[PDB]
Amino acid sequence: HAPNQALLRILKETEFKKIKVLGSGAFGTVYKGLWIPEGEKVKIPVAIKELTSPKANKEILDEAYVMASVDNPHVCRLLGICLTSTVQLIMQLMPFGCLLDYVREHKDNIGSQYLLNWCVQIAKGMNYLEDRRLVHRDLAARNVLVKTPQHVKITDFGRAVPIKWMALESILHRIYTHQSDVWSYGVTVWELMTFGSKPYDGIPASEISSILEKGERLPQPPICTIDVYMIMVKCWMIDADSRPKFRELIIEFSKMARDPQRYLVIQGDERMHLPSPTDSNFDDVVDADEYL
Ligand SMILES: *[C@@H](F)C(=O)N1CCC[C@@H]1C(=O)Nc1cc2c(Nc3ccc(F)c(Cl)c3)ncnc2cc1OCCCN1CCOCC1
């Protein structure tokens, strides 16, 4: 058990300025924003999460405790906090949002190259969380954020219940493990391969435990060769050590992403194209990942 040497950064409310609401949900309000620090001549695009009961402040700072301890190119990092009346969290801006709404609203351009890279990247992030002995407990396509369409990161592990993503031993005994995240990674891939479909759609979350104990699982997407679906199926096995480890999910999908059309059959997948750093895409603005 090594000493967590993460630096926690305190920001002034006047160094950054909000710009627009990204989502006034139940938790509170998330804003697109710009952060202009000190006299550094840089503007970092950020997101800002604000919610003053003392029950909440302890939680928003425990979440911030975790998100300050991670550093990986496929996991979202905390940039800092702001100590106003309620605590504000300042994270890197992922301009394209959750992957779940990105695959729904762009399915007509998602070729097999992206789907398999995303599968690699998510696995790389989860394998980092394995090295950091960190169990996500809520991997899903909504908890993946799209910086660029070829760069996604895992978020929302402030809980380190959504039954349909949960492993079997997570529903009957609330046993959560790295090898239970593999199952949620499986449902997450299933989400990507069905371009945003709802798992076990229509079924009440009650019967999901029976369904799985008999031996039923999620369907095989059309675009999915048996090579891919075999992976998703191995994630959903009863015995947990029989499921793949994330460093294997990395290796497998890496093979498949070399010949993407051999494993995902998408009609039109050859001239699809997604927005990517080419002439358009993007005054003194720098990305957070290059500001250290
Ligand atoms: C899907 F689950 C989802 O999140 N959706 C669906 C559309 C909007 C909303 C979304 O993407 N919001 C969003 C959040 C962030 C975050 N979130 C965050 C979590 C925790 C925390 F502590 C902080 Cl400080 C912030 N961080 C970074 N960037 C974003 C960007 C987001 O939305 C991107 C822009 C909207 N998007 C979707 C609609 O059409 C245009 C693009």
Side-chain angles (χ1 to χ4, degrees), residues 1-19 21-37 39-54 56-158 160-244 246-270 272 274-278 280-292:
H1 265 324
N4 184 342
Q5 291 253 54
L7 299 182
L8 171 64
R9 190 132 171 169
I10 314 296
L11 312 181
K12 319 169 158 190
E13 66 172 354
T14 52
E15 288 197 289
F16 61 84
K17 55 178 194 181
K18 300 176 182 62
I19 289 193
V21 193
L22 282 175
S24 55
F27 48 84
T29 36
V30 182
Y31 304 96
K32 182 183 186 303
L34 251 201
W35 172 41
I36 319 186
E40 310 226 324
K41 204 180 87 185
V42 294
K43 313 165 192 181
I44 287 86
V46 304
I48 315 169
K49 196 227 276 192
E50 82 183 335
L51 312 149
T52 324
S53 71
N57 287 272
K58 193 198 94 76
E59 273 179 81
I60 213 75
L61 292 168
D62 287 338
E63 182 194 341
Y65 170 83
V66 185
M67 310 217 63
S69 307
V70 293
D71 189 25
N72 189 262
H74 300 285
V75 184
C76 297
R77 198 194 194 187
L78 181 62
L79 292 199
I81 53 175
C82 183
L83 288 169
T84 49
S85 41
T86 180
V87 185
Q88 299 203 110
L89 306 171
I90 294 87
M91 300 206 325
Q92 177 191 40
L93 176 59
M94 307 294 266
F96 297 93
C98 59
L99 194 46
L100 182 45
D101 273 284
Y102 190 68
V103 300
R104 289 178 188 174
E105 280 145 60
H106 292 68
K107 55 168 148 278
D108 285 27
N109 287 89
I110 297 169
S112 62
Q113 185 77 252
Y114 288 98
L115 284 164
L116 296 173
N117 296 335
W118 295 344
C119 275
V120 173
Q121 299 186 354
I122 300 162
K124 290 187 157 180
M126 290 279 90
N127 179 71
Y128 178 90
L129 293 205
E130 187 147 42
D131 295 342
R132 297 302 319 279
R133 308 177 72 184
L134 230 43
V135 166
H136 192 297
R137 298 182 63 253
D138 189 17
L139 185 54
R142 63 190 124 76
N143 300 327
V144 180
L145 288 176
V146 182
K147 170 184 186 183
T148 74
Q150 43 280 93
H151 196 175
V152 299
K153 300 179 186 190
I154 308 178
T155 188
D156 205 294
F157 43 102
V161 289
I163 286 86
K164 298 178 176 171
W165 282 249
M166 292 174 50
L168 182 77
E169 79 276 34
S170 293
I171 310 179
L172 306 175
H173 295 72
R174 308 134 157 186
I175 286 187
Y176 288 71
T177 167
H178 294 264
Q179 297 308 119
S180 88
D181 287 334
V182 170
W183 186 302
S184 309
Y185 177 94
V187 188
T188 298
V189 172
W190 189 97
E191 288 190 69
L192 301 184
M193 299 304 181
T194 61
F195 293 93
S197 294
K198 304 188 174 182
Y200 311 93
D201 189 28
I203 292 89
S206 324
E207 322 166 1
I208 303 292
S209 189
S210 287
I211 290 181
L212 273 46
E213 276 185 306
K214 305 137 45 194
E216 188 185 315
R217 295 296 183 273
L218 289 160
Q220 166 174 4
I223 58 160
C224 274
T225 51
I226 187 186
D227 300 79
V228 168
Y229 187 58
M230 187 69 51
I231 292 170
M232 296 168 36
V233 168
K234 292 175 184 178
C235 294
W236 301 333
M237 292 188 56
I238 302 295
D239 190 45
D241 324 288
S242 303
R243 297 159 184 158
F246 282 111
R247 60 90 60 180
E248 288 174 334
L249 296 167
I250 290 172
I251 288 182
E252 281 303 275
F253 285 97
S254 275
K255 300 173 182 168
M256 310 207 285
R258 274 185 145 253
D259 186 11
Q261 284 147 40
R262 183 174 162 176
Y263 306 90
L264 294 184
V265 191
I266 306 157
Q267 188 78 314
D269 164 32
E270 255 294 356
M272 278 202 157
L274 278 175
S276 286
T278 44
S280 316
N281 206 37
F282 303 113
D283 199 288
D284 271 272
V285 48
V286 192
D287 194 88
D289 287 327
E290 288 77 62
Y291 181 53
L292 283 146

